[PDB]
Amino acid sequence: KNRAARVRVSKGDKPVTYEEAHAPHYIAHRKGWLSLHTGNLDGEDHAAERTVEDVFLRKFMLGTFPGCLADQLVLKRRANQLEICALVLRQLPPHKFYFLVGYSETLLSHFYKCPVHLHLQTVPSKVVYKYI
Amino acid sequence: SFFTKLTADELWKGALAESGAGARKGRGKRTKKKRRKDLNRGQIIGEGRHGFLWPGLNIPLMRNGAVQTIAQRSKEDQEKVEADMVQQREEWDRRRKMKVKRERGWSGNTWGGVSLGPPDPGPNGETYDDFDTRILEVRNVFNMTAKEGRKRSVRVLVAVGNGKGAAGFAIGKATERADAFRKAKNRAVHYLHYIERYEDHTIYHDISLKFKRTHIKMKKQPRGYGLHCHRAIMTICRLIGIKDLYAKVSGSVNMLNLTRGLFLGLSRQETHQQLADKKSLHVVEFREECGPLPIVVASPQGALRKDPEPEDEVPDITLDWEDVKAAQGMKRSVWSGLKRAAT
Amino acid sequence: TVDFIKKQIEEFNIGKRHLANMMGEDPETFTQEDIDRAIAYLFPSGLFEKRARPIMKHPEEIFPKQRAIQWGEDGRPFHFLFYTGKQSYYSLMHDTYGKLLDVEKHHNQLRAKDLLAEKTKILKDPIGSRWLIKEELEEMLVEKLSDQDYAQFIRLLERLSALPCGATEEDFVNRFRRSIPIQSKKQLIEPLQYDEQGMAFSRGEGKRKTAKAEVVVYGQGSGRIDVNGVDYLLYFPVTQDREQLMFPLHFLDRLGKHDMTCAVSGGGRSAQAGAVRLAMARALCSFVTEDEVEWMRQAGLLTADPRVRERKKPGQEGARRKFTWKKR
Amino acid sequence: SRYGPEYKDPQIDKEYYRKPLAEQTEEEKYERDFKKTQLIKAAPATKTSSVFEDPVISKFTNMMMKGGNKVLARSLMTQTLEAVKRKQFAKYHAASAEEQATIERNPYTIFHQALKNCEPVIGLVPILKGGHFYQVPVPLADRRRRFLAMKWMIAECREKKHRRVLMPEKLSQELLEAFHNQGPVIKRKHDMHKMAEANRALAHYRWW
Amino acid sequence: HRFMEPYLFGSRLGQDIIDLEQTAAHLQLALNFTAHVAYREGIILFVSRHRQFAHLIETTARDCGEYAHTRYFKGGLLTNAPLLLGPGVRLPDLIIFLHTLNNVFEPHVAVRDAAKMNIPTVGIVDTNCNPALITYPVPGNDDSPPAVRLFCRLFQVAISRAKEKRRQVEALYRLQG
RNA sequence: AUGACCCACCAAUCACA
RNA sequence: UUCGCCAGAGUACUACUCGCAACUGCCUAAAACUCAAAGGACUUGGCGGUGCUUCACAUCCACCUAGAGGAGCCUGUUCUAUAAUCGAUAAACCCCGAUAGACCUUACCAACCCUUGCCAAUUCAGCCUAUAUACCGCCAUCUUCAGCAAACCCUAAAAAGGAACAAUAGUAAGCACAAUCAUAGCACAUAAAAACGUUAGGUCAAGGUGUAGCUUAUGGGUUGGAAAGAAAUGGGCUACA
Ligand SMILES: [Mg+2]
Ligand SMILES: [Mg+2]
Ligand SMILES: [Mg+2]
Ligand SMILES: [Mg+2]
Ligand SMILES: [Mg+2]
Ligand SMILES: [Mg+2]
Ligand SMILES: [Mg+2]
Ligand SMILES: [Mg+2]
Ligand SMILES: [Mg+2]
Ligand SMILES: [Mg+2]
Ligand SMILES: [Mg+2]
Ligand SMILES: [Mg+2]
Ligand SMILES: [Mg+2]
Ligand SMILES: [Mg+2]
Ligand SMILES: [Mg+2]
Ligand SMILES: [Mg+2]
Ligand SMILES: [Mg+2]
Ligand SMILES: [Mg+2]
Ligand SMILES: [Mg+2]
Ligand SMILES: [Mg+2]
Ligand SMILES: [Mg+2]
Ligand SMILES: [Mg+2]
Ligand SMILES: [Mg+2]
Ligand SMILES: [Mg+2]
Ligand SMILES: [Mg+2]
Ligand SMILES: [Mg+2]
Ligand SMILES: [Mg+2]
Ligand SMILES: [Mg+2]
Ligand SMILES: [Mg+2]
Numbered sequence A: 001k002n003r004a005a006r007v008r009v010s011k012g013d014k015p016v017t018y019e020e021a022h023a024p025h026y027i028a029h030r031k032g033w034l035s036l037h038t039g040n041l042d043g044e045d046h047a048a049e050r051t052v053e054d055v056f057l058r059k060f061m062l063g064t065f066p067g068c069l070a071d072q073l074v075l076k077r078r079a080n081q082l083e084i085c086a087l088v089l090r091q092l093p094p095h096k097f098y099f100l101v102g103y104s105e106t107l108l109s110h111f112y113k114c115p116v117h118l119h120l121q122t123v124p125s126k127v128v129y130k131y132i
Numbered sequence B: 001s002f003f004t005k006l007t008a009d010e011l012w013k014g015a016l017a018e019s020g021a022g023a024r025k026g027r028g029k030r031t032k033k034k035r036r037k038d039l040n041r042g043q044i045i046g047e048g049r050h051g052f053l054w055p056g057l058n059i060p061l062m063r064n065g066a067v068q069t070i071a072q073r074s075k076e077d078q079e080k081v082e083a084d085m086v087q088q089r090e091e092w093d094r095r096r097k098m099k100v101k102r103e104r105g106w107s108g109n110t111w112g113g114v115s116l117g118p119p120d121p122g123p124n125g126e127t128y129d130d131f132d133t134r135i136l137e138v139r140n141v142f143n144m145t146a147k148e149g150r151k152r153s154v155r156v157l158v159a160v161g162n163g164k165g166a167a168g169f170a171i172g173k174a175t176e177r178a179d180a181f182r183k184a185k186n187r188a189v190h191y192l193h194y195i196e197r198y199e200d201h202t203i204y205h206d207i208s209l210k211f212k213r214t215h216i217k218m219k220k221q222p223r224g225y226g227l228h229c230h231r232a233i234m235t236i237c238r239l240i241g242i243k244d245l246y247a248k249v250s251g252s253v254n255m256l257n258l259t260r261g262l263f264l265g266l267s268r269q270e271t272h273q274q275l276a277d278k279k280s281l282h283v284v285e286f287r288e289e290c291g292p293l294p295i296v297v298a299s300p301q302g303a304l305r306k307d308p309e310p311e312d313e314v315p316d317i318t319l320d321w322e323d324v325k326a327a328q329g330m331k332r333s334v335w336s337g338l339k340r341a342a343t
Numbered sequence C: 001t002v003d004f005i006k007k008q009i010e011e012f013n014i015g016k017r018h019l020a021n022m023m024g025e026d027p028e029t030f031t032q033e034d035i036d037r038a039i040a041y042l043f044p045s046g047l048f049e050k051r052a053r054p055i056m057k058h059p060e061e062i063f064p065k066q067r068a069i070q071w072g073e074d075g076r077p078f079h080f081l082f083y084t085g086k087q088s089y090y091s092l093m094h095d096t097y098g099k100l101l102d103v104e105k106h107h108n109q110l111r112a113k114d115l116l117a118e119k120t121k122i123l124k125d126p127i128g129s130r131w132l133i134k135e136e137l138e139e140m141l142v143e144k145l146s147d148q149d150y151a152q153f154i155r156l157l158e159r160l161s162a163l164p165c166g167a168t169e170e171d172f173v174n175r176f177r178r179s180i181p182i183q184s185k186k187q188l189i190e191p192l193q194y195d196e197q198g199m200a201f202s203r204g205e206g207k208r209k210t211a212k213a214e215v216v217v218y219g220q221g222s223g224r225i226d227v228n229g230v231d232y233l234l235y236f237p238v239t240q241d242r243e244q245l246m247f248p249l250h251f252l253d254r255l256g257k258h259d260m261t262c263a264v265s266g267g268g269r270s271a272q273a274g275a276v277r278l279a280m281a282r283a284l285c286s287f288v289t290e291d292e293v294e295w296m297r298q299a300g301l302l303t304a305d306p307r308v309r310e311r312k313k314p315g316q317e318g319a320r321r322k323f324t325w326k327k328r
Numbered sequence D: 001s002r003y004g005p006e007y008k009d010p011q012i013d014k015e016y017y018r019k020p021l022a023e024q025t026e027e028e029k030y031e032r033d034f035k036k037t038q039l040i041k042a043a044p045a046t047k048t049s050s051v052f053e054d055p056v057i058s059k060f061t062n063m064m065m066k067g068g069n070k071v072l073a074r075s076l077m078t079q080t081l082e083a084v085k086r087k088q089f090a091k092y093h094a095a096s097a098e099e100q101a102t103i104e105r106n107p108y109t110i111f112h113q114a115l116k117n118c119e120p121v122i123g124l125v126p127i128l129k130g131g132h133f134y135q136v137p138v139p140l141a142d143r144r145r146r147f148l149a150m151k152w153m154i155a156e157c158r159e160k161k162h163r164r165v166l167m168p169e170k171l172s173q174e175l176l177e178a179f180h181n182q183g184p185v186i187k188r189k190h191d192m193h194k195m196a197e198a199n200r201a202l203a204h205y206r207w208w
Numbered sequence E: 001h002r003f004m005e006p007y008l009f010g011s012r013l014g015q016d017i018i019d020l021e022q023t024a025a026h027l028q029l030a031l032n033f034t035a036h037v038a039y040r041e042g043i044i045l046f047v048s049r050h051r052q053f054a055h056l057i058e059t060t061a062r063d064c065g066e067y068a069h070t071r072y073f074k075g076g077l078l079t080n081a082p083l084l085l086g087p088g089v090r091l092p093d094l095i096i097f098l099h100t101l102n103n104v105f106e107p108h109v110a111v112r113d114a115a116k117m118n119i120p121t122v123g124i125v126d127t128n129c130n131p132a133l134i135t136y137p138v139p140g141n142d143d144s145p146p147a148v149r150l151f152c153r154l155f156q157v158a159i160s161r162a163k164e165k166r167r168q169v170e171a172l173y174r175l176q177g
Numbered sequence F: 001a002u003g004a005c006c007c008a009c010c011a012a013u014c015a016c017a
Numbered sequence G: 001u002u003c004g005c006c007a008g009a010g011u012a013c014u015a016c017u018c019g020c021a022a023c024u025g026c027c028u029a030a031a032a033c034u035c036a037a038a039g040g041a042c043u044u045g046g047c048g049g050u051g052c053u054u055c056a057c058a059u060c061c062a063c064c065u066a067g068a069g070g071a072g073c074c075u076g077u078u079c080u081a082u083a084a085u086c087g088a089u090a091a092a093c094c095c096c097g098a099u100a101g102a103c104c105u106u107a108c109c110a111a112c113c114c115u116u117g118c119c120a121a122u123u124c125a126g127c128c129u130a131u132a133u134a135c136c137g138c139c140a141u142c143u144u145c146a147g148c149a150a151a152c153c154c155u156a157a158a159a160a161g162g163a164a165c166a167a168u169a170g171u172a173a174g175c176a177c178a179a180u181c182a183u184a185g186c187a188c189a190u191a192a193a194a195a196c197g198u199u200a201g202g203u204c205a206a207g208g209u210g211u212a213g214c215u216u217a218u219g220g221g222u223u224g225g226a227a228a229g230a231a232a233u234g235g236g237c238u239a240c241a
């Protein structure tokens, strides 16, 4: 059987996001891409760099916002600037949320040598597509 | 080596090995047990062992109406903080290793006799808190399946009663023990018997029944003699509200047959009133302690007979060689006279 | 779930006002079409599944039909057939059978009075009339159905329509009529074209197997064919290919009467022969009668040949051919 | 099978479409053909409206073909027909008026007569009974017998010639020998008929 | 059927003759009950599985303002109500059987299941039917059209009369104050 | 024609003061 | 109402006795010892060189085409061989991890070297050490197979079963199949998809990990070596014109 990026059927109680509810053969058909950048187009360069950046960004954002991260990150790259769009549970007081917004934006702007935008969309609890 | 790391969920799923092939066919023992503990449980945002204090996270943003600068704790302060977190871990390990007490029904490892607590409220909002449920028998049962081979379903037999004379049993079956418990409760509420109780402690009259291969023999006791019976029957009796009885079971002791036969035999009871009405006579009780005094229990509503009952010099009744052997003192069994704990 | 639909329609109207405002259009003349263009522009999701694309539509179209409340506040069901568990379907059947009984009674009274005044409306066949599918019936009753249920119903309708038809009865069985769309396979004739004092030239375009052919035929000329600026005898050295070019002309007996020029690209020699054959056949349909067009279609001249190279598959050799399979 | 089951095969015959008015049942039939809105398969590259093409010559051509060569096989077919023609002209002009009335110069009728003479009447199928395989006489369908004829021809004229000898030569030789019934191909057909008589009792083993 | 013998007047040349004295005595009580149920505003279901009188019965119940199941009886219908019918439901306070059998000649499930449900049951039990689990059985002919029609009519009238008397005693109740 | 032995279901949580 | 029988299984229609035209006989009928069961009926599977129907669409037979098995080479296994890796290894390994080994890669062998020895800190780093029968991750396989499954309901008990459409107890959300999507128009075809489980199938050497092991060494470097064909065989390439 194909195990790739699949959430196996449970006893029927298992809450599932729209994201996790669709296997790899459904990309570009039903679910879209979690990253947007030019580097994978036909005549273009530095796909490798954008990829390693991507990975580090997911890992980093997951570690910087413990427990409040709802869905997988959305990374949009436009003309040297990267906008990170995130779905975030309401856990921390807005004080901590802003603290980490600024801290992260600054830190990654100085790390990757480009302007970093961070857009937080807050949601009460994980949005459920299926089962449950 | 940073990219070489993973999510905590992935790591626990990996280390626990629940989804393996050893778990399914029971290829490994149940005495081997390991658990998952959250490592984010006691941690706060901003806290590290370097000891920093961040204006938005660790400490309040404004002290004395001004903005607090980024600062670092003293060495000994961090020592006390780490001591506190360590004592927190040891506290949760102290909480985890303590096993809650399970009230034992009959035996330590048996589920029989155990109370499941009041059944679940019906769809109409109907609620029974007056009902208690006891487990009669839990049994692991198997079926051979084309793919899976042996397939294990638990089936439990459970009885409910309010203590007021209404009781009933039912059976339930599931892959999980919990599920079967629920099913059996909720199903049991639907089948209820009314069991008439003479003076609300004993039964009305001596019963003997052969149900299938089981023989139940129940004798009606006076007030002080508590529940001398097979343990299952004692349970069902405490649920019915029968406080004084003697019952011997012979032949196959198989549980289900025992309770079906039991409830049938108790359902077949004939009240003094029914007797009074079918014979059209006064049924009159003679206490031994009250002497010759003729207490009238039941009177035949409608027209009483002027005709006396035909007197049979010698009665024709089926007699159990056991009762006769008892009456004449030929039962010498070392097991019969034994002193036991309270009902 | 009624408050839900009320709210959804409120916010759909408000949102349609907003969308009409940002798109710079009259909020009154805004249609579903315009809504579609608007969201297609504002939220451009390339996704191959069209049901996974952004949608703002009226809540009645988006949400599924709801079974209404089946009883009053006292508990008594509204419909008398409620306890059947299918009230809609069995109501339908009750009324259908009631009307079949009605037809039988009325028509028997007319048998006793020496009158058969009715006619058979049972043949709608030129209208292309058919019954509902089970899906349509299922949607009409807002209730799930079984194959035997639908078959039962339809059979009873056949019983009804096979008798003398009343007006109310005809109107009744005509809810359950659908009309199959236009059935004609007749081709669309290329209007003949007159160019620069030259008369009667027609065009056609064949496509076969990586090979495209554009063919212009003149009915005013003698027999010859020029393919990519050269003679057909030069361009197609193989006899088979010249026979392929000869097929439609010989079929219509036009073999000496027409003069053709062609542009054919890609594929091999036989693929080109076929593409030009098809193009030529489609080009000669302007010069001929409407019957011989049907004759060419029935000889297989006018249909493109769908047969095309299949993709090689991984783990195999030839898209069919498999690697050598070892038993032991 | 890029065509659904809906698609009918094309009728390539011109004579059928040209002269419809004299037949009622066939008028009704092809009326039902096109008016049914019936899809038609695109006519094959091999088949033409040509007055000069024999389906049997085309089948034999295909059956000669190795690899993907229609060109080389059509070549050898053409050359064999031409070789039979000229062999019969050489036999014609060296003869006398009687034998000039008798001898056939049509390579087409010689082809068809050679193959009709070379086709077997009866055949053999192996049947398993009691753990033994018995060769049993089986009546054959037409197409099977035509096939066997052609395949036997090509088998022999491929196999038994000297390597110097060209194909149209050997094939024309054997076409003219099988026209006159004296060829080794007809000897093969006779081996078949003799092996079919030797086993004739075993014809009871056949259950169909 | 063995339990039908106390209701038989006798057997005339192989045919069984139901005693109509007992039939009247029973039908009296049956109609009495049925009307009293309709008066107190409760649900009456006409159940028969016979395909002759199916339409007639559906018609009858529609005209009494009562409910009819004449079709294939779905398995868990009375026992498991909330799943088949809906989230919460009321169940018929009386069920009337014009035919106590199903077309395979076994007892109609709804008898056993209405018993199971604590619902009282009135039914017309023919010579071969089982009366045991039926609350108010009326012994009589269920096969011939005038008998079925007679009973249809009778129950129709009892229902209608009950509902009317309810209306009128209600009007009297409203004029009392 | 044949195909060591051995394989299986008898333990309970999490969260808060 | 009587009579005859029966007190776990084997040992045992046996040994020893009595009687008997039986003398390899019948009849009568134990014990030592061994075992913790032996038995009777059923249930659901699986299986059947069991029967009856219906099929197979590259598929069994009948039949079509081209190949393999013989030759040379190429490449992989198995053996033998080396101081000198590992993994796959019925179907479901065998141009397989490798869309790739002259050094490197590289894990192996022989010599030599280095012991807070990649990192911000750490009585710590590091380990291609053992266990794929602790696992996650990816898959193979049945399989283009149609089932799996929660929640209920029924059964003179239920291990389990649950359909009859002129319908007899079944309703069921969900997941698969189906439908849509892709192969730039349909259609077909192809691709993709294919649940739950099965084979403790494959992989601790992708990486990560449980448990158990090494720590001036089972760790980190440098230099140079890794041969070979008695034999057997798989898959290919080129042919025999
Ligand atoms: Mg204990
Ligand atoms: Mg090929
Ligand atoms: Mg009857
Ligand atoms: Mg042996
Ligand atoms: Mg064995
Ligand atoms: Mg013994
Ligand atoms: Mg004997
Ligand atoms: Mg003996
Ligand atoms: Mg002895
Ligand atoms: Mg094959
Ligand atoms: Mg070759
Ligand atoms: Mg070979
Ligand atoms: Mg070879
Ligand atoms: Mg190897
Ligand atoms: Mg290893
Ligand atoms: Mg190995
Ligand atoms: Mg294997
Ligand atoms: Mg090396
Ligand atoms: Mg090493
Ligand atoms: Mg494994
Ligand atoms: Mg299905
Ligand atoms: Mg049973
Ligand atoms: Mg079941
Ligand atoms: Mg379902
Ligand atoms: Mg498509
Ligand atoms: Mg398709
Ligand atoms: Mg596939
Ligand atoms: Mg699919
Ligand atoms: Mg293994």
Ligand SMILES: [Mg+2]
Binding pocket: none
């Ligand atoms: Mg291995």
Ligand SMILES: [Mg+2]
Binding pocket: G204
């Ligand atoms: Mg490792």
Ligand SMILES: [Mg+2]
Binding pocket: none
């Ligand atoms: Mg080296």
Ligand SMILES: [Mg+2]
Binding pocket: none
């Ligand atoms: Mg080799």
Ligand SMILES: [Mg+2]
Binding pocket: C323, G235
């Ligand atoms: Mg290979």
